[PDB]
A paper describes a structure:
Aminoacyl-[name] synthetases (AARSs), a family of essential protein synthesis enzymes, are attractive targets for drug development. Here we present five unusual crystal structures showing that [name] ([name]) is covalently inhibited by a natural product, obafluorin (OB). OB contains a β-lactone ring with a 2,3-dihydroxybenzamidyl moiety attached to the α position and a 4-nitrobenzyl moiety attached to the β position. When [name] catalyzes [name] aminoacylation, the Zn2+ ion recognizes and binds l-threonine, assisting in the l-threonine activation reaction.
Numbering used by the authors:
A (entry chain A), B (entry chain A): 242 to 640
Write the structure that this text describes.
Amino acid sequence: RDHRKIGKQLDLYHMQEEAPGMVFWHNDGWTIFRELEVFVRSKLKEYQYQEVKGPFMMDRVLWEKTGHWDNYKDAMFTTSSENREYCIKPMNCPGHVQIFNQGLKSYRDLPLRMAEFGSCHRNEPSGSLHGLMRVRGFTQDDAHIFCTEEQIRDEVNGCIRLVYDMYSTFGFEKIVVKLSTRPEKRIGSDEMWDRAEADLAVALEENNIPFEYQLGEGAFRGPKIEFTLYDCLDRAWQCGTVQLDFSLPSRLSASYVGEDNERKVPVMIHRAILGSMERFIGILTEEFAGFFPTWLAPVQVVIMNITDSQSEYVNELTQKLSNAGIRVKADLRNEKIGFKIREHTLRRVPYMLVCGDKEVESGKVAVRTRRGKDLGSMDVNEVIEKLQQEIRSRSLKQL
Amino acid sequence: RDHRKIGKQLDLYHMQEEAPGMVFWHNDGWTIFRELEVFVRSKLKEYQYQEVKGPFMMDRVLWEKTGHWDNYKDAMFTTSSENREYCIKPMNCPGHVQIFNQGLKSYRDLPLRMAEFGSCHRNEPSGSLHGLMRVRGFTQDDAHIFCTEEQIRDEVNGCIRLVYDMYSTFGFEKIVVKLSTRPEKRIGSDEMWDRAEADLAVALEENNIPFEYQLGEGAFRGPKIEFTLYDCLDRAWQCGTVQLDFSLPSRLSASYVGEDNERKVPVMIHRAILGSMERFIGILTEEFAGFFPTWLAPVQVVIMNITDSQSEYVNELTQKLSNAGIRVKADLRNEKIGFKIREHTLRRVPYMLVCGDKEVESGKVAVRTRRGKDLGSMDVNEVIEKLQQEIRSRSLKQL
Ligand SMILES: *C(=O)[C@@H](NC(=O)c1cccc(O)c1O)[C@H](O)Cc1ccc([N+](=O)[O-])cc1
Ligand SMILES: *C(=O)[C@@H](NC(=O)c1cccc(O)c1O)[C@H](O)Cc1ccc([N+](=O)[O-])cc1
Ligand SMILES: [Zn+2]
Ligand SMILES: [Zn+2]
């Protein structure tokens, strides 16, 4: 369970000194990355999230307008063009407010949930980088919710359900939730903080979540929730966050017309469920020790012949499986069946179809699994129906 | 047919002076963008392309090693960290060679086709920017093919079929193909250029392509093909390119073991079919004048009630359509049916389901189209089956 070693073994990705802290996603690693996006997008559709894409760099004046310049100028890559200074974005938050600021918003547009798979960059010191855990370039399952003060409870509830629903898919059921203590220096009136804290307390009680408080001084712009998961080694990984913001929407001139026809500043909720998706892939790689679940496996099926007679039967089978949506490969090499089955077992391919002369004549296929289990000859249509169920259900275990 | 005006009318995207030449993709514009990616990925799977993701910035030493530094340093955004200079990538080519350089390659790995939806940036002068046509940040349907000299014909054939197959999906059937004349200053032996030119000439003859030559001096690293399409206004848009490269793989120390067991440098083919996908969306926006085909339309169906009695019937219908994969919205507003049908017609929603008291009791739905055609009451299952066919076929016209 070392994601850097398994990543090299499975040809998932690589890094080199020319771009420290930035991942070269290979084909198989990118397949895992994109399958994660499909999973998140499926959850986004459930909770009615927009998906947007912001610009990678933005004017340094805009970043100074947010107030994040002074606090995080060290971590921000800077670039220039035509006597103007630009910042490679370390966060997606101001860009979403820019999209929100387009057009007039009323209360009828709230809550407005805006998600983005935003590529962000941070100038982290090189000595602190490690694999996919600590990088300079990363993609967050980020989203921001624009809502009234009244909707804070209902929106935090949805984030809470999202965290537990999503972590459970991967097998993470032990979750520790920590709440933040309000600092001395804070933005926003005390009554605003008091009302929002009641919203958070009611939401956490509603979901029956035992929560602890954190010794850290907490964020100045709002109350913060952090979700930590535990992998099969009982290792704690902090991935989720729900951060309230009373500062940024006021700074970036965001507003909406309320029911009373009065100009109001929306409440802004920052939330990520998995956090850094590169980091989450590394966590998943160590969690499964390379035995990725079928829906996450880069190559899900390999079909092999025994000799060249079955080689054309294999090619039809590969096409029939590929049309069914299965990520399949054909192994027609001039190696005998024990060699290929072992090699694809070592590469963690979930299923392995053996096509002998009996298999060609029967119309069936001989099925082996990467754990060495022999499921015997099965109907080709039956095989497809079972993997499709395993893929669509995103099941954690095989047949 | 002005994509900037239609983009504002349909809330597709926006741009602001804080990030000149970079697009804020709104939800509906991002839906078109992502649907284009799915279309390209479907074509990638047909031709057995890998999909990878490279780092956004790379060491300036690596860029100087390519030789693109001296020619294109002006157009490249530069940034630094820890006394080292980095370049925000304007091209995906060197990053793919880096991924190719991982692991030992043999001739049995060739041809190796490597595609990437790579976000690239160029420091284009601000006065030259225009909408999505001329931007600083763009995403290309880029790919690179690593192959032997012998495979150049078969690979150019696949690129040629890809260009015509993909342009035809959008209704672009008039295509002008231009070939490049070899310059005085060139990289690679004359015999290499002579053999590759024969490969290109045979490939273009094979597909029966009438081609012209270009007065431009042509690329120094290899022969170049450019594909121009014509929209419904008979306007020429140059989108596709197939560029041969004898220079870069040798520079970046790329190699493979041949059949003769000799260390050889692969031939590199750069190819993009649509080119800048932001630019292609703008072309598509003007081609359809906002009447996007059903598979490309941001919102494909709107269901409306006449009064609150049908409001709960509409919500079930919206869910049943959404589970079927249709991008659908519910319009339960307190406006009468003529108001809503007109508003969604003005917003170019392909289909429009009207749910009266007759519709609730029958189990059917009243169907209108954005062209004003009345298709009458239809079965809800029948409606779903027809849009699914229209979406999956990517048909250019409605029922
Ligand atoms: C405060 O605004 C906080 N933002 C978030 O925590 C946040 C989490 C998840 C999703 C979104 O959209 C969020 O805004 C803070 O700015 C986080 C942060 C810390 C450090 C740096 N840095 O430049 O080193 C950037 C952002
Ligand atoms: C020559 O290498 C040429 N590259 C391409 O034309 C190309 C087209 C489509 C896909 C890929 O992967 C390609 O490499 C040239 O470098 C193109 C180019 C021109 C200008 C600039 N610029 O920095 O202004 C960059 C790239
Ligand atoms: Zn945020
Ligand atoms: Zn290239």
